[PDB]
Design a protein around this ligand. Structure first.
Ligand SMILES: *[C@@H]1O[C@H](CO)[C@@H](O[C@@H]2O[C@H](CO)[C@@H](O)[C@H](O)[C@H]2NC(C)=O)[C@H](O)[C@H]1NC(C)=O
Ligand SMILES: *[C@@H]1O[C@H](CO)[C@@H](O[C@@H]2O[C@H](CO)[C@@H](O)[C@H](O)[C@H]2NC(C)=O)[C@H](O)[C@H]1NC(C)=O
Ligand SMILES: *[C@@H]1O[C@H](CO)[C@@H](O)[C@H](O)[C@H]1NC(C)=O
Ligand SMILES: *[C@@H]1O[C@H](CO)[C@@H](O)[C@H](O)[C@H]1NC(C)=O
Ligand SMILES: O=C(O)CCC(=O)C(=O)O
Ligand SMILES: O=C(O)CCC(=O)C(=O)O
Ligand SMILES: [Fe+2]
Ligand SMILES: [Fe+2]
Ligand SMILES: [Mn+2]
Ligand SMILES: [Mn+2]
Ligand SMILES: [Mn+2]
Ligand SMILES: [Mn+2]
Lengths: 679, 679
């Protein structure tokens, strides 16, 4: 039984990158001793050769040399030394599928049955004496290949047998990922994750993301060895910092017509971060949003430490605008953090900026998804063309079956970047631009090209993404038509704030007349925009029974029937079934129309029955302020609703029993919305 | 100016028939002096010749000889004498269109332009001396024609010129009806009626219904001269009597299957006449009515002085049965009046027998019509074939625009006959039988053949006639299907007695639950016969909405849909419009059915909505006596109708609001009738 205190791990690193630190944390988890050369590829052997002179006689010592930037450790020193002894080798190299650099040498390699045949110098383990005898032979220069130097020495059949050199053909200790991606799966335990090679049924110690397998290693690195575990949750999510706070440049990008932009702009005033510590940059590419931004700008200027607007007049491309905002932070030594936030990102968590800063990463994004769907502001995997690909754990992340902070190949729409990273590691201006590749992908490639991890946190609920795809802007109030595409935000803007409480009970609903129910339905903004949309149409004027017309406009005339029918199904239907227990509705309504009452034209509506099972009657403006005059009188009951409430609706039967009358409007203008449901 | 005291009217009569008395009353109206020969046709001249010897020298005297049985006087003696002087004749005969008996003598008659050419001995006026010179020449015998005797003397041209004989060619004084029916119309005044000859524009004094114009004279006799006047009403209706009362034989004839016979039999017990003075004869030709009559017979026997039933077993024809009943009165000297009453005659006036007896006629019928139509129990006129013909005043009589007691050619279904008339004037037994002519016409001919008037009184409202035409007897309770043909009697039997008061108001209708109305609709007899008709069918088992069947029978299965739909239109529709002001109904209902609740089969009905605008729910039996168990529960109201009332119906909305439940029937059997109206 070899002594773990006799095992030394040697690696090379010239900077403490995130990949090097990820390797080190995996080594510390298993209590390895690590010796790092070069913190102050032929240069690797030069440093190792020098380092090995101290151990030229140490037959008692076992040394494992591995890369660090693209390596993680998955097993303990005890298991590692046990497998090394089981190999019966005195210096065991990692094996792989490809013979590089010299392809011609593939002939001299011994025949291997089912295992890997060729050597890989990214990982080997052996006695210090044997290793010293190999690396002392290096005399070349730093730019010459170390793989071929180790190669050439191995294919010397006399030296291979003298020093007992071997390759780990079946990945018992070393797992090189290149050419073996389909052999490697995660193997889970309670508080630990490692990999299994399903082709050889081994549990390797060293995971080497050699070649173009860096993202596959980033994926494995999110779990192995203590990254995320079924019982402890994620391991580095808590350890890395899970009076005044840092100064932030907040950059907002409006690159397309976007629903609910006034709501987004107002939400910027609500973010829970000292506004005297935030500098706002806003780029707007759309003339459609200029009034929205002009409306909000006085509040934004009074809120934040400084503000800057770059408008459509400047004709900046999205990539040119993102380069500009990011460089404004880069060239300002007081910008400690850069917060990029796209207009289609809805932040429900107002502490999002604090939470992301505390995670203490170079680059980190909050996870945001389209409501109820899988599409999110990140990708788990890339196609070889850098097109989207679904990763093995993407659904679990999006559905928050697994929460944590994840190393991912692509993020978008919202991220927080350390300002010192922009200055020291990505100093160039062409981060998003400079190629015909998409600006958002060019950004991610730029960071991946520097070995900077792109982190994604689903540790908290942060918000959602708006659908902007086919946002029809040919309306006076286009967000009225957003009931299908963004129903969550449509509800928060247009459905009455106290509706849900009324639907759930709590005594909001009233019964002012027998079997006439009264509940809040529409917000004041919905009422104003619906009225304004009706008057914008302008062409004013039904299924009533007396023994009966109104000046009105039907939803179909203005192209709002399908939308109003959706509101009926989603909000009125459930309300009716709660208030008339035993009745069930699909919210059929052929008659949906706004009627206008004025003393100048039609001020009243004579007694009648509606052609409906029940009628919805929503006031749309204020009694007293917008009109003087009565509301609705149900004759068989001697009951009048004298004071209608703007966003509140009446629910009453349409036939037989509720003969009703529209009392004359005596001043101003009275607008109501009425649907004859279930005819 | 000739003196009216110098005018003597001479007529002949061997008995004081109604026609003679009608003539006399018309003579008394104008204050004529009448000398009647023979109260103790050649015999007419013999009596006149003898009578004239007293006046052979009376040049101061004017004498008018007229028949009496078929004559009425229409003008005064003053007008008569004025016209006689204007004629410039000394003996003026009536003229007519036909030369009888000898047709050959038509040549010797003087040419007449537009007027009547030939003589008629039924009426003439002249000086007593001139008349004596003519009638003293008669020496023949009583069976020889008087017309030819007067004829032959007139066509003697020398005697015609010597005595100044003339004919009333243009009907200035005498109006013979035969051959001039289209020349004669009534001329009305305030308190007097006479005739005008429109062909000559005259106002005759003497109306002679000679030949086959006796019925036309009877028609004129109903008005002329003081018969019926626009301002005094009828003149003989009041004058002829308009402790114990006379004994009556009441004869009832059931000659066809007749609706509501139990009601007729019960009504016999209600007639306002001392039953100890009435003897009941009832003939029933129908086996269908034997149970009806057997049911009633103990009450009838205990009510009347004596009773006799002649059943279908005897195989009497209608004419043989009417002869038998009438002869039972004829051969009984204690039968002072015979009252014949057909089963299809509904007497609403319970004093009908008293009223008709008081009118003091030989034969008189109360006017009865089919409800709302013109057909009645009398004819105003006959075709020459004795088929029905409409008279000039028939509609006025039927509509009671003119009321009185009318001399008519035909009566049926109800009449009161003086018993002494049967004994002394119509002693034969073959009154209705003896020929292939219809029994009811043979009866009328028999009386007309004896100069007996058939009177008809519409002075009061007496009753109506049932439709019996196509009475379908293939039912357990055939009168249930009589809603179309006899709706007045159908209502009195089957509609709840307090329905009409409830429809008119008066606080009968109740509202036990909100918008559930409760009113009496069906009589207990309707409920029992409907239930019994359902069980007679036997084959027990819908448009309900829950989140829902019943053991029931639909009206269509038993052939009662059209009838029930008529009840809905006539009685439920108006009730619904009164109780739901503003709602209007045509009473559409596709679902009409009786459901049965029993603990053994289906005892309850789970909560549901009906497929209807409103639902009619009529209990059909008694809670407690027929079943134990609850009724109807409306869930949204916490309101139960625990005690249903047998003939009462519930009226409630069918959709949205009145989710309702049929509480379990725990004993017996519960029957209800339900219609889903206006689906
Ligand atoms: C929704 O309901 C809330 C509370 O039921 C309303 O807020 C109240 O408004 C009155 C005056 O308008 C205040 O005196 C109360 O203190 C408020 N309550 C709370 C809890 O703030 C609110 O106005 C309703 N929304 C709308 C649109 O009418
Ligand atoms: C129709 O209504 C009348 C009166 O409203 C009911 O007759 C009453 O019946 C009660 C007992 O049943 C008596 O005490 C009253 O004196 C009766 N009133 C009269 C005026 O006679 C009658 O029962 C109702 N008809 C039905 C079929 O229920
Ligand atoms: C690492 O070593 C320490 C003692 O220095 C020990 O307490 C700890 O449990 C070890 N951890 C592992 C994973 O071996
Ligand atoms: C008939 O004569 C009487 C007098 O005797 C007279 O009062 C009456 O008015 C007369 N009537 C007519 C109709 O001439
Ligand atoms: O003015 C009102 O409140 C009644 C409107 C109404 O009943 C209708 O539009 O049918
Ligand atoms: O039993 C009752 O009273 C309810 C009957 C009912 O609602 C129905 O027949 O639809
Ligand atoms: Fe209405
Ligand atoms: Fe029902
Ligand atoms: Mn490497
Ligand atoms: Mn309209
Ligand atoms: Mn005569
Ligand atoms: Mn049924």
């Amino acid at each position: 039984p070899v002594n773990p205190e006799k095992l030394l791990v040697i690696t090379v690193a010239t900077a403490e990158t995130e990949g090097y630190l990820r390797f080190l944390r995996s080594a510390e988890f298993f209590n390895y001793t690590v010796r790092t050369l070069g913190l102050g590829g032929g240069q690797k052997v030069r440093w190792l050769k020098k380092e090995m002179e101290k151990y030229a006689d140490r037959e008692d010592m076992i040394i494992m040399f591995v890369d660090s930037y693209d390596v993680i450790l998955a097993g303990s020193p005890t298991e590692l030394l046990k497998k090394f002894v089981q190999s019966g080798s005195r210096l065991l190299f990692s094996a792989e599928s490809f013979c590089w650099p010299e392809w011609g040498l593939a002939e001299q390699y011994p025949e291997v049955g089912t295992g890997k045949r060729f050597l890989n110098s990214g990982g080997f383990i052996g006695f210090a004496t044997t290793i010293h005898q190999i690396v002392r032979q290096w005399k070349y220069k730093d730019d010459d290949d170390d793989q071929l130097f180790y190669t050439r020495l191995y294919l010397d059949p006399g030296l291979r047998e003298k020093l007992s050199l071997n390759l780990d053909h079946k990945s018992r200790i070393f797992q090189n990922l290149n050419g073996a991606l389909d052999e490697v799966v995660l193997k889970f335990d309670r508080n630990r994750v490692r990999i299994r090679n399903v082709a050889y049924d081994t549990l390797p110690i060293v995971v080497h993301g050699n070649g173009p397998t860096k993202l596959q290693l980033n994926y494995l690195g999110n779990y192995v060895p203590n990254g995320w575990t079924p019982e402890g949750g994620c391991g580095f999510c808590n350890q890395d910092r899970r009076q005044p706070p840092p100064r932030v440049f907040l950059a907002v990008f409006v690159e397309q017509p976007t629903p609910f932009l006034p709501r987004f702009l107002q939400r910027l005033l609500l973010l829970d971060y000292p506004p005297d510590r935030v500098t706002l940059f806003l780029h707007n590419n759309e003339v459609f949003h200029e009034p929205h931004i002009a409306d909000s700008w006085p509040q934004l200027q009074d809120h934040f430490s400084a503000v800057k607007l770059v408008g459509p007049e400047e004709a900046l491309s999205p990539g040119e605008a993102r380069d500009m905002a990011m460089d404004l932070c880069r060239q300002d030594p007081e910008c400690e953090f850069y917060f990029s936030l796209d207009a289609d990102a809805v932040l429900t968590n107002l502490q999002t900026l604090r939470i992301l800063i505390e995670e203490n990463r170079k680059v980190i994004a909050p996870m945001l998804s389209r409501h109820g769907k899988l599409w999110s502001n990140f990708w788990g995997a890339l196609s070889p063309d850098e097109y989207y690909a679904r990763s093995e754990d993407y659904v679990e992340l999006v559905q928050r079956k697994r929460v944590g902070v994840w190393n991912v190949p692509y993020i978008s729409q919202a991220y927080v970047i350390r300002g010192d990273t922009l200055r020291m590691e990505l100093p160039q201006r062409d981060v998003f631009s400079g190629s015909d590749t998409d600006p958002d992908m060019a950004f991610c490639k730029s960071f991946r090209d520097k070995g900077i991890f792109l982190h994604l946190s689903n540790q908290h609920e942060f918000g959602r993404l708006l659908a902007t795809s086919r946002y029809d802007t040919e309306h006076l109030h286009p967000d009225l038509w957003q009931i299908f595409d963004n129903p969550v935000d449509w509800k928060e803007q247009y459905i009455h704030e106290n509706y849900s409480r009324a639907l759930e009970g709590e005594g909001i609903v009233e019964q002012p007349c027998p079997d006439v129910y009264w509940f809040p339905l529409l917000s004041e903004q919905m009422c104003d925009e619906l009225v304004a949309e009706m008057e914008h149409y302008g062409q004013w004027s039904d299924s009533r029974l007396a023994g009966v017309p109104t000046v009105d406009i039907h939803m179909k005339q203005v192209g709002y029937e399908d939308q109003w029918l959706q509101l009926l199904r989603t909000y009125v239907g459930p309300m009716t079934e709660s208030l008339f227990p035993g009745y069930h509705t699909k919210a059929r309504a052929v008659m949906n129309f706004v009627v206008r009452y004025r003393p100048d034209e039609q001020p009243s509506l004579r007694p009648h029955h509606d052609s409906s099972t029940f009628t919805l009657n929503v006031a749309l403006n204020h009694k007293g302020l917008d009109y003087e005059g009565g509301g609705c009188r149900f004759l068989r009951y001697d009951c009048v609703i004298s004071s209608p409430r703007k966003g509140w609706a009446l629910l009453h039967p349409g036939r037989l029993t509720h003969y009703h009358e529209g009392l004359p409007t005596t001043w101003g203008t009275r607008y109501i919305m009425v649907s004859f449901v279930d005819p």
